[PDB]
Structures are given as C-alpha cells and as structure tokens.
From a paper:
The lipocalin fold contains a single eight-stranded continuously hydrogen-bonded antiparallel β-barrel complemented by an α-helix. Fluorogen-activating proteins (FAPs) are a group of unrelated proteins capable of binding to non-protein ligands (fluorogens) and increase the fluorescence quantum yield and/or change spectral properties of these ligands. Here we report on DiB-splits, a self-assembling FAP split system which has been inspired by the domain-swapped structure of a full-length DiB protein.
The asymmetric unit contains only one protein chain. However, it forms a biological assembly (dimer) with a crystallographic symmetry mate. The intertwined dimer is caused by domain swapping: each of the two Blc-like eight-stranded beta-barrel folds is created by the N-terminus of one of two polypeptide chains and the C-terminus of the other. To further evaluate this assumption, we calculated the interaction energies between N- and C-termini fragments of the wtBlc, DiB1, and DiB3 proteins using Rosetta38. Despite the fact that wtBlc protein seems to be slightly more stable, DiB3 is not an outlier, suggesting that the introduced mutations are unlikely to cause the domain swapping. Independent from the reason that caused domain swapping in the crystal, we reasoned that the DiB3 protein as well as other mutants might have two relatively autonomous and stable parts (residues 1 to 108 and 114 to 177). In our case, however, the obtained DiB3 structure is pointing to a potential cleavage site.
Numbering used by the authors:
A (entry chain A), B (entry chain A): 19 to 176
C-alpha cells in the first residue's frame, strides 16, 4: 500500500474545513518513531498556502540535548479538500536533489548543486578555505552557468 | 524537468566513493532559499544507511531566534553509486501521510493517523485534555484497530 493513503479500513473526516484547522495544536500523545523519540512540549502550527496546500511548523524540546528543535513541511489533499487525507513533504536545505559537480582527490572540498542553477553550495571538511580554493570553485561554477553573485558566504569559526 | 535530476548541461562526478564522503562538512557558501536564510555556522554530517542510501543531519545557528536548529533526511543514488546524482527526502513527525480520523464540531481535539496503524497522534488546541476526551479518543482509536498501548503521552505545561 501507498505511504500517502490511510490505513486499510480506517475512515477519514469527510466535511473538513482547513480554514478552522489553522494555527497551533499541542501533541497530547504519539506512537513513537525515531524523529519524535524523547521530544517534550511538542506543537504543530498549520497555515494555508497560496496553492491550496497546508504549511506546517513542528516545535519540540529535546531534554537529552537541552534545546528546542523545529521541522517544516507542507501537506496536500490527495482528493477533495473536504476529505482530510493529505500527502506530506518536509522542507530542508537540499531541495529535490543533491549532485556533486566538483570534488578534489582527497575529499576535502566539494561543489554541490540541486535540480537547477538556483541551487548551489560550497562544502568543506574545514570551516574556512583558502582564496585559491574559493577561486577554483567559483571558476567551475561560472563555467557551468551558475550566477556566483547569488552566493551567501556563511559565518564560520576562525 | 525533474527535481531529482541535475540542471541541464551540468556534469556530475562519475567515480564517486560515498565511504570517503561520510562525516561532517562545513557549508562555506549557499544560494539562499527560505529554509537556510539567515543560518550561521552550518554543517551537514553524512552516514551510510543499511539500504545503500546516505542519511544526513544539517545543523545551523539562527541569530534572529538565538538558537541552534537541525534537519534530518536521506538521499539515494538515482543511477550507479559511482555517479554523484542523488534524490533527497527530509524526515519529520508525520511520515507519508496525514489523515484526520476524529474531530469535534469546534475544531478543538483531533485524532490523526499516518499510512498504517503504527502512526497515530492525539492533537489539541490546549496543552491538556480531560480524562473524558482521552477516553473518547482512545475508544475511536481502539474501534479502528490501533494499539493504544503504543501511545507516549507527551509532557506539556499545566
Ligand atoms: Na538551470
Ligand atoms: Na495498518
């Protein structure tokens, strides 16, 4: 069976109004899986997308690591929007795809792209790289048609 | 074009050894999207799955909200494991599906399941519910074949 259909024989709510479901919900109880194991004070907050999906933000406190954690995704109705059966997608940095397009012999410096030229990263085993490595990486990116003026260079420790 | 193929005309590394790529990488630079906007001190840590995919954990500091944030997902080769082109899936609480199977007239208390009877939540607009609402929610779950002994009831404020 699909991961985007309900369990066999389980009936879903059939007069759902997503507008009244928006906002914050407290998780009272869960069946445990790896992702939520040990989380406390868990909430989910739903908002309506321009395209008719729901966006959601999940928040919970991890007592082990002593810090708040969060997750973001979207959900789309699989049928009529009055039937509360939805398909879920979680958000993250590397949308759609992860393609290594440059890599040194020693696996120290990588240029990684997504599914089109709007998705590009420079990754390193070290928090800083030499201007020489920056210039080599920017040359490969430019030669393959990425606009390297779009880079946000990330704050890292000295 | 697919979100799980590289940009047109971009060539990927073709003698990739995922074993040498494992462990921690620092994000030196990114093209900005909603998910990473404003994040500092960003890393990704790769590990090998039993099924041949890569697991990854992304970590970054959000200076706005003054706290560390993290994200988890997996990536699978789309072809030969020596061609560094991968499809990405992010992890979260509500795997595969989100199905509302019980809801009161006032949109205050919900029973929500995933794609099989191993996925179940009780959600509330309030951090606590009455034993009456607990018993109503557990009765519906039991009547539809969920093992309500699997619930972890979540710590919430009084
Ligand atoms: Na492109
Ligand atoms: Na089932």
């Amino acid at each position: 069976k699909s991961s985007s259909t309900p369990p066999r024989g389980v009936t879903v709510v059939n007069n759902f109004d997503a507008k009244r479901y928006l906002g914050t919900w407290y998780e009272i109880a869960r069946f445990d899986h790896r992702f939520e194991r040990g989380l406390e004070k868990v909430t989910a907050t739903y908002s309506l997308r321009d395209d008719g999906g729901l966006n959601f933000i999940n928040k919970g406190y991890n007592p082990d690591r002593g810090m708040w954690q969060q997750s973001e995704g979207k959900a789309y109705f699989t049928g009529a929007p009055t039937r509360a059966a939805l398909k879920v997608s979680f958000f993250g940095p590397f949308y759609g795809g992860y393609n290594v397009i440059a890599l040194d012999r020693e696996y120290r410096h990588a240029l990684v792209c997504g599914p089109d030229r709007d998705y590009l990263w420079i990754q390193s085993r070290t928090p800083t790289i030499s201007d020489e490595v920056k210039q080599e990486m920017l040359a490969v990116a430019t030669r393959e048609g990425f606009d390297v003026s779009k880079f946000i260079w990330v704050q890292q420790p000295g």
